[PDB]
Amino acid sequence: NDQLVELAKDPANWVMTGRDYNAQNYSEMTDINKENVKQLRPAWSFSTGVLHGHEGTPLVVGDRMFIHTPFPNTTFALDLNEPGKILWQNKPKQNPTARTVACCDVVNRGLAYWPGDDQVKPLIFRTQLDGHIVAMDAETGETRWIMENSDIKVGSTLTIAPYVIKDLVLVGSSGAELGVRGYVTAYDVKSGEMRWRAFATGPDEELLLAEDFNAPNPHYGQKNLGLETWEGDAWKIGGGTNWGWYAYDPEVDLFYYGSGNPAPWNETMRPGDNKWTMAIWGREATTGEAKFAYQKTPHDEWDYAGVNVMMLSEQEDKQGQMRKLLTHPDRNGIVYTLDRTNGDLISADKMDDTVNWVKEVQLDTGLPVRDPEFGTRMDHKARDICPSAMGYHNQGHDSYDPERKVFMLGINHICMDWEPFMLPYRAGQFFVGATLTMYPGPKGDRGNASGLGQIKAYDAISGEMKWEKMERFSVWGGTMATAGGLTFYATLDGFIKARDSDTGDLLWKFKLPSGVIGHPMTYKHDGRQYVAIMYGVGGWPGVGLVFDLADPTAGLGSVGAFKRLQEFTQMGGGVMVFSLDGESPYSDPNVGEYAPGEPT
Amino acid sequence: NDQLVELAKDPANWVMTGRDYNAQNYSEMTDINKENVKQLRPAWSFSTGVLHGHEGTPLVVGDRMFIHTPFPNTTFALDLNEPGKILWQNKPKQNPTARTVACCDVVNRGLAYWPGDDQVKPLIFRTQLDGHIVAMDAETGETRWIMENSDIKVGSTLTIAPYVIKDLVLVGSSGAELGVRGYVTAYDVKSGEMRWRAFATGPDEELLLAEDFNAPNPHYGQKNLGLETWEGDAWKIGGGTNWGWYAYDPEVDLFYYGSGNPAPWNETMRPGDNKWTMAIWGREATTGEAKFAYQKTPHDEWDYAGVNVMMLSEQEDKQGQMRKLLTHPDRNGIVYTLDRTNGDLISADKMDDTVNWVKEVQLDTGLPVRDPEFGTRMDHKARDICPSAMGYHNQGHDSYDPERKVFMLGINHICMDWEPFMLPYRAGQFFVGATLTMYPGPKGDRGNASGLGQIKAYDAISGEMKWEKMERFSVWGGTMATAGGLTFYATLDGFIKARDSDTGDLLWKFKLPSGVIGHPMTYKHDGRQYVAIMYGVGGWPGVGLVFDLADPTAGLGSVGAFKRLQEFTQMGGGVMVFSLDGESPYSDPNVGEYAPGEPT
Amino acid sequence: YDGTNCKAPGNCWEPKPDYPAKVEGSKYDPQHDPAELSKQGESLAVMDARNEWRVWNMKKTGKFEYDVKKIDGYDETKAPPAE
Amino acid sequence: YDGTNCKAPGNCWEPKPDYPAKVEGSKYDPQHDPAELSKQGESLAVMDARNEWRVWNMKKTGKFEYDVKKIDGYDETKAPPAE
């Protein structure tokens, strides 16, 4: 959508997940910088009325901030002129059974916005856990349409944030732990009429491939690999769901995203490279046809679901030429960079030397050289594999500083013990088939279950780490960088931190009500620069805390790794907003005060 | 307790509900005052991880802050040296059936603290909705003992905060809407052994009266009134439960508290004065024997439960006689002042001229001249009664400024339509018997349903209202006054405000995550004065929002009166602390950061 | 009924115009079931009962137990041992 | 199985030492009931079907309706009118 890129040029709004189509979570504003970040204070706050994981970030368009929530996923609209008033709220009615088939908490990653045209005013889009995608008028919040995308009767839910391109709203999918075959779908923003749908496994007509799919890199694989890499009909239940993020290049009209892990976790029950799970996609937006696809993890064996953030940038080649790129910090521990117009493999570095499932990735063949000593297989218990299923990087939406040309990566430092087991597939039931035991990586404190995270500034071309810092817990919510030389992010233990982008020094922080798992956002209102972030620990890291568990292997093996978390935070939910000296529309006490008049 | 009156002398501690036995919610500190107040910013915050109404106020004792919460009532302890750490938490296992017999949300008003002695260490006391009273080691949070005080099987729950005097802890009672006969019980802080117990209705022996009960004021009534002001055995389910607050004068060794309303609400079903419900009590802390008692509302007809706050002061009569007083702003819309040693009725004014169930309170007889046009009775729908069942004043624990000699009162402006109906009493089932329609008083906007609160500075002796200010919502959570000329209080629409104690002007306010129903508090730590408060709307005014009610008569009639509350706030739960420029232990970014290994 | 006409000190209730002086035997007679009106008291008795053993056991053992079923010497129909 | 010996472009899987090249027949045979493997596809089919009716009704009526049961002319076995 052209108007959306136009609206993104104004520091006034944050119209989509990663702020703009390049998904960089970067702001050109310098009001808040290294010099004055010490004076950053809370301007106002808002509780969502619901607990559980609060992922994603709010959207700002003019004098309005849009807030999504975890189950029952009610959407709120706040008046920025006086954040105290709630313009509107759309609260749906869902079958609480949907909560039953959610693998990793009832989270939701965000909303989407369509600029509207001369026929239909601006619309806000939301996805619901129960499988529905819905459109609502942005002014009043009243529902325009609703369509069914995923059936919870088969363990198919929705947690991903909808994404708008031109006149299409994209809807991903969740449920690989339930054996759901992954698929992305495009609906018309106005009618909600399905324009196309593309699966991650099976025949090439369901895979939706362009006549010249993977032509620039034939070795990546091309035709009929959707069936050929699976034994029998196993692909009908082979995951591949995309619940991560998107990116889009309007110039070549290609949006990018990653397909998830194959089902079940038991690798012995599914021989083959299981394509096209664990792949990076380059799909034509209007038609949905794939121009290229690169499988990062052939025949997965660790649940390295490849749905992570896709950050776009234009940097200089290692041979000295300007290349249009795509950087992607994967769950398997590798940070991939490709020519986003080719699928050309340019960089594939380990985010931490401790990654041991792979010795290295060959840039000429693109194949990862597995280290047999760390794979998984029936009748065997692999140990100290890194990364763990939670990966060295999860759902967190990171950022890129176009000026310093570095990526601010929120990393996880977790490894695991893994032993699979046989199990039948019953639609609607779980189809995992593996027992885990997770804990801190070699650089952490496995003795005390601490030191499970890291944040680093990475250079895609040189593959060098400008600076690295250890965090007590995994930095799960992503990051945001600004022209002010600051890199914001939040922690699971309750803080929003601001670091020096050049040195990685901690310049400021605040103790929010609860841990964070969403990414920071920034907008400008009434000539003032605000920084907002959501809080409310949850997601996979918090299932133990959230669902009061004690078995260390419970929560797909996450409960153990995070048993200490509860000593630093409890559940929560809301959005906290900051500014210099806590300046807000309420600095003048009277603003908002009751005056007999009419409805406030 | 003596050392308790001592710790109270140090501005670093807030050891009990109203800080000290005089229960004035007054601060001697001036760091924050009429000047700097505008530079007050959030220093840190904590999420309780639970929802629903958050009443009461946190207790601080040295380097620790204790926090109570609504069902499941789990207790927390924070390290003030670095608030991000949770020293300990005690989470009980209660029968969820308790929620079933709670009339007005599953709230809890506070904790109690016992300084400990050479035998046993300091103790933290809590009450649980399921009727248990429990002691815990204030250093580890380990349970010492738990006793059964209330039975939910008969509709008897606990919401009131425990109270410590000498080596005893007082436990109140809740359940009048379920026909529960009220009674206060005292236990040994160490053994948890029951010392005494006094009921509010029935025979003098169970009432526990002193040999000279009311000798000073015989006209108040004396022997056998708890049996003669009732027909037959009606008193066996009369109510009079005390769930408000206490006050204590160790000089005369007497504590004070107000007894609740009589059951049912259908007045026609219980003819008689209904003593001793709706009374002010003066009992010996060691025996529990009453020295005096005054019934403010004989034969209740409006649910003006007389359990409100008891603020002790030492002022001068109108005859120039220095008297140890007690001011009490009751639900009936009258604020009373008696001699806390004698029982003499010094003052009894109308908190607002709209009160119409009474003409006036004759100071000589001590009787409320009723106005038949505003009473209730079977087969009659009374209209426009003020105050409403919620009263012109509720559970909010207010404050008194010794120096300015005034009382900062948080008032409600709600009237109502009332209609009784016959119904059987069934142990464990609701026993109300009345349909109500509440709405804004005459001084508010009844068309738009706004303007239901007021904040006024009241002088007891002169009976004057220094200043008055109107709020769009009932100021429901009490107030706090400081030596700096400031009076803090929070609103239901989610703000914590500070007004000029002399002019009542609004000098500052902050938009908290959710509305407030508890009172603010302050303490000095690390040489810095902080102002903490709890947010999380709920309680009676919020039952409609918390339980999703749409019928205007639902919520005992509160739903219709607060139907607009939903446009200003959602549920929440936590505590937020403030200070000048929000300085805090974390002003040094590196405090509490991950510092593994042996640094030094 | 203005509340001033007191039958005696501390007792000033008077039937409102057109209402009985005694509800028993009137169209307003609540007719409460005594069996029901006594449940509260019975409930307090059992709790105090159980609580007695909780206080005793902790003194005699130095440890505290809530579940009376796990106290040595407990008996529903019997008070604690004089010790 | 190091992942570098490909049977063809994009196909580099090999059984680990001692493990079958085909699970069918081996002791690791999943034996997926075909009835089960079909639930998903069937589901998408019925949802897409209902969506067509939803889309059709808003276009013809002018107002939106989610519950197909309340759509004038809704027939579970047929697709909306070819118009």
Ligand SMILES: O=C(O)c1cc(C(=O)O)c2c(n1)C(=O)C(=O)c1cc(C(=O)O)[nH]c1-2
């Ligand atoms: O198989 C799937 O489709 C799927 C879905 C989701 C989801 O929608 O939350 C997660 C996962 N897998 C997953 O493997 C995982 O690690 C995970 C973490 C989270 C989170 O929000 O913290 N969601 C998910």
Ligand SMILES: O=C(O)c1cc(C(=O)O)c2c(n1)C(=O)C(=O)c1cc(C(=O)O)[nH]c1-2
């Ligand atoms: O008579 C009782 O025992 C009883 C108990 C309580 C309670 O437990 O808080 C309330 C009430 N009554 C009551 O009438 C009322 O107005 C009320 C308001 C609230 C609140 O916390 O906002 N609780 C209660």
Ligand SMILES: [Ca+2]
């Ligand atoms: Ca997964």
Ligand SMILES: [Ca+2]
């Ligand atoms: Ca009551």
